[PDB]
Design an enzyme around this catalytic site. Sequence first.
Site, short mmCIF file in Angstrom:
data_model
loop_
_atom_site.label_atom_id
_atom_site.label_comp_id
_atom_site.label_asym_id
_atom_site.label_seq_id
_atom_site.Cartn_x
_atom_site.Cartn_y
_atom_site.Cartn_z
N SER A 1 27.24 28.37 -14.78
CA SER A 1 28.45 29.13 -14.70
C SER A 1 29.30 29.73 -15.30
O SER A 1 30.47 30.51 -15.12
CB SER A 1 29.21 27.89 -13.64
OG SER A 1 30.25 27.40 -14.66
N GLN A 2 28.85 29.65 -16.71
CA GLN A 2 29.63 30.39 -17.74
C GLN A 2 29.04 31.98 -17.64
O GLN A 2 29.74 32.73 -18.29
CB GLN A 2 29.08 29.84 -19.08
CG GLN A 2 27.55 29.94 -19.35
CD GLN A 2 26.81 28.70 -19.41
OE1 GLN A 2 27.09 28.26 -18.20
NE2 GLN A 2 26.29 28.26 -20.42
N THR B 1 25.08 22.10 -14.06
CA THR B 1 24.81 20.85 -14.80
C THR B 1 24.22 19.83 -13.87
O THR B 1 23.42 19.22 -14.14
CB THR B 1 25.93 20.34 -15.71
OG1 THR B 1 26.42 21.23 -16.65
CG2 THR B 1 25.74 19.09 -16.35
N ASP C 1 32.08 24.74 -15.57
CA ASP C 1 32.70 25.67 -16.56
C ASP C 1 33.46 26.72 -15.91
O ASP C 1 34.71 26.87 -16.50
CB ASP C 1 31.73 26.59 -17.49
CG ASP C 1 30.88 25.66 -18.67
OD1 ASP C 1 30.98 24.45 -18.48
OD2 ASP C 1 30.11 26.33 -19.44
#
Lengths: 326, 326, 326, 326
Positions: free
Chosen positions: C58-59, C12, C90
């Site tokens: 990062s998910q 993000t 995440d």
Amino acid sequence: LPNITILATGGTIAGGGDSATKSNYTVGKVGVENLVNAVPQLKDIANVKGEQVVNIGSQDMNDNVWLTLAKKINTDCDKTDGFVITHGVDTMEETAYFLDLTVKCDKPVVMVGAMRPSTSMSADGPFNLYNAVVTAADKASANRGVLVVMNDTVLDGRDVTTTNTTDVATFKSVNYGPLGYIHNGKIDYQRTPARKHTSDTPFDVSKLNELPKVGIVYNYANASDLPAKALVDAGYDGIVSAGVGNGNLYKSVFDTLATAAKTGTAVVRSSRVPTGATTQDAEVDDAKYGFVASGTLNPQKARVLLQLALTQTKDPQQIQQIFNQY
Amino acid sequence: LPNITILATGGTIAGGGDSATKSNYTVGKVGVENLVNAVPQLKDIANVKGEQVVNIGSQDMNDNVWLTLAKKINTDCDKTDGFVITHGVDTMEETAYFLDLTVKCDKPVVMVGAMRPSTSMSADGPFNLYNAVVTAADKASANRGVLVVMNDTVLDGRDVTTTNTTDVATFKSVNYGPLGYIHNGKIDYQRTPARKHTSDTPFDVSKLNELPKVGIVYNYANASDLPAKALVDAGYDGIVSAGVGNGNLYKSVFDTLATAAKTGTAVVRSSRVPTGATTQDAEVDDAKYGFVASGTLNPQKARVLLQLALTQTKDPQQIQQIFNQY
Amino acid sequence: LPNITILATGGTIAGGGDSATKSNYTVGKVGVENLVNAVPQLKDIANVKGEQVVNIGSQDMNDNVWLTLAKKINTDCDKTDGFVITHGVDTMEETAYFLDLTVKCDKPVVMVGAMRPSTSMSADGPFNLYNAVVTAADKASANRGVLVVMNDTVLDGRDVTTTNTTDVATFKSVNYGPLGYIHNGKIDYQRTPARKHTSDTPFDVSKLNELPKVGIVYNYANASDLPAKALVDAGYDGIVSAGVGNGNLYKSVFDTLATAAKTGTAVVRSSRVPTGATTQDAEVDDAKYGFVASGTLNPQKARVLLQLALTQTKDPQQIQQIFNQY
Amino acid sequence: LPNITILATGGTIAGGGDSATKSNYTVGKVGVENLVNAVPQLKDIANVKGEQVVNIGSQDMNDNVWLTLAKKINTDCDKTDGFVITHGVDTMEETAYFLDLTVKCDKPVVMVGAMRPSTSMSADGPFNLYNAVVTAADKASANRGVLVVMNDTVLDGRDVTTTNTTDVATFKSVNYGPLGYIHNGKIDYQRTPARKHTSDTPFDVSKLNELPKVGIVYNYANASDLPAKALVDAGYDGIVSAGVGNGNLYKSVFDTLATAAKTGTAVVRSSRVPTGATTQDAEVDDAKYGFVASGTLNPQKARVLLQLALTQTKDPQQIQQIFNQY
């Protein structure tokens, strides 16, 4: 789109320093127009009108700004759809509660501030102000009493307090929690304060020029009685104890306050402990000394309620009832 | 099994009421040997010896008791393997930090109390005491400074504070966190305080019969300067400000303290906000005024260190360096 | 001024949307050099060099990226004075602990991200980045293991976790607390993790192209055993249970895991409860079943350590000793 | 004095071990009569009647106990003035919410448990049970939905969750806060849940023999799709994702769940993150996949609402509305 009035009082949200990066800043030299123009997207959500009521650090907040604000909101209630009040962090919890108890406008009244100056990198003020306008424009925000909006969260003016000296997330309702959270310009309200506020209180400041004198004294080990004596000697109408633990008093301070109460000084036991109620039926026999227990009100918030109680009565029993209802 | 000495001072841990159910209690009619006999499982983990130092509510804790405790622990260090001190909850955080700074024994010194009376349903004191003795008998507890053990948690004496007026889980290290959690009679220690404690401080109280006079004043909207003036008029050695937000001072209070600091009174800016540091380089030019910023030390903790700093120096630059190291 | 290397992975912090106001965003169309140029004050504190390692949400973080990062940092250690890794929020807590256990460079390695998009009002990324670089340039940051810097706070890689879905203050070390707070570009470090990290671990990933297969299963009322069975049927090297309360397992899940653990699958009991240790000596006889208790490691953190333990041993007694040291 | 029914289901409150001091214990071997007789003072507050509905660890809670409880309360509502339900800690937040959504009795329904077994030193169960009876007897507790009372605090069954594996203070309403605090057998209620509960929900379990099948899958770095596939292959009616961050899914898990939703499986995105809402209008286009966002409901609580939604509809849009109202 709704009409929203910004009443500006100064604060860090209106603060500035010479570097985006260094922590130094001053307040009192940034006007409301500048704050509005830093948030262009407010046009998408309201017709904003700003007025600079005063321009001060909230460490210098005082009775007369309180009276000016309440009278102004009550007076102009019919000219607008909601109010936002820009204010410093330091005493926001005190002003928010005063207004919670004295505004008769049941249109949304929202306070907002910033932890970082307007000049800093990642300044929190712009988005906070946006969210305060969102809140003030939301019809669902009416009849919840006076509100603080900070860090994407709507907080009731009674329980709200600043919990950290520097953190952008400092404002929390530390006993009963927030009313709703703001995401993408929308609020899911799940709570409303049950304590009586606004048009359900008897407090009417419309004709008041001043407020009863109430001081706060701190307790700690080996506490001097000198501060308590100095308020008593000056004829203070009320004293709030910032007590230790469940509102307990160092013996010195107890004696001075007990004697004060017998001469008609109102004495409210609160606590320096940041959460939880100062209760009756603990270690202090309040009925016996003519003391009042503050409940979940912290010392500065107890002062607010005490001053207003003292405009109606000096009877400790009736002041306890006020502390149980508001 | 280790020899552990219990120094009793009072508190709710050996306070009682008329019934298990109701909240009312008076403190200090239970004896030290009494508390022990109530927890027969203590014999599984130590040979405990108990001495009653004083028997008071910790709301009446004072400089004399502090000095008595520091000297006793320091004189008796070589005669036991560790110390538990039973104490009231109200000012436990003050006493713990005083001892943290003055105790020269690096054997474990563990403070413990209770939020519920001896006599109450689900009294917390027995297991608190047990866990306090577990902690004092653990070799891994040595050299971590003075500790507080409450609610299965091992907390350092500098950061530990009471966060709620009634909750059994009140004691938390709110800025840097606990040192270890106790489960099934063992401690997994994962932290130790970096700030200098016990034998790494220059504070030596062995030959002192009194401490410098330090008072605390509270800040809030429309704050009177009369408490601060009362302390200056009495010739106090120091004054701690419980400031608003990041240690800021109401204008009148600021005027009185500016004067005090150039007139023989050390002035430390702390904060009424329950977490975070009072910092330099914010709104207050500390150097200009001769003020000291307290960092994470809350007002009552800042008093402790300021009293001890004043045994060594009156120079605000040196006092600030102390506040930066201990 | 120190040479600092930024290894970008995505997140993000260099994610964006169509407007400053609205919440919608996609991640990974902003470049590493781009992020730098946005924070020109970085030049006041370091000579920063940026490399894009991968550009993902990062998910979708995975074993390959972990291995790539560990090896890069380890190979490049001697070529810079410190590292900042930009990363999604995440799974930041997973990557930080993997690197905590595998990084052999004891120069500062600081991870950083943002909860608000690049493009948003009051974006948190710029100042986060600045503070991450402050931390990586501080000599006092060395030898504390892999760090995460968010919201003015320095957090150790083992205990740090995300506590809220949207709040800028989400990242907290929820069991043992932070290491240091950053103000005005300086850090007052008061804690360091006792658990063994970086060069004090035997985990050596320099020549590995894959990690052992470890899966996570959730417990809840009426929990199906089908997820656990799917992992056992695939011949997974390990399974972590996100247990209820103190690591307990729904009966069906317990049956399937009891079988797995005697059949070539290591089983670690963790907990879905966001704080506190999953302990031995509670309701589950770990020795009888061949199970390992995770202590304070949450499920996704327990996976990290279990994967690495399985590079060294399949013996549950040895795996438990690993969980007791790292 | 009011008539209060205790429906006992087992739990640690009914647990026991061979030592007061060691952490080991089992549940299922301590009957309701024993709990009542351990709290003699309950005679002062209610006419208590106990029934043992089941006697199990709440790690083994399941649909059929849920249906039995709801039907029993709805059936016996007219025979009593209130209900207390003794239950394990582990799944209390799940049972409390189920009952919040299915009980039609608007008389107080209070759940209670204990973190320490009945055999331990400073056992929390007795006072918790006392306070649960207080709560159940308080006329002011009606129409607040189903309640959990733990550690002197009254919590609403929707937001309430267990936050620590071992702490007696673990139960918190982590998003919206508690409803009231209990002191000296009295409750000051300041909050009520605005989400629709009890007789304001359409869910009627009076004729249901079973509940739709809903499973939970966890997300983390390198997450296997195997658990999600195993629920799909078994024809599950619904799946809840314990997502990372703001309810995000590892790519594998996303694909399996997207395909599932197109065949008519209900899919609800929640979050493994312990506080905050899983929102719409973030990174997942829910409308496009036929997914539902869970709001502040954690995975286990989303399962509860999903199962009940699935008794009324399989339409994702209508399931989203249910997730926005209950």
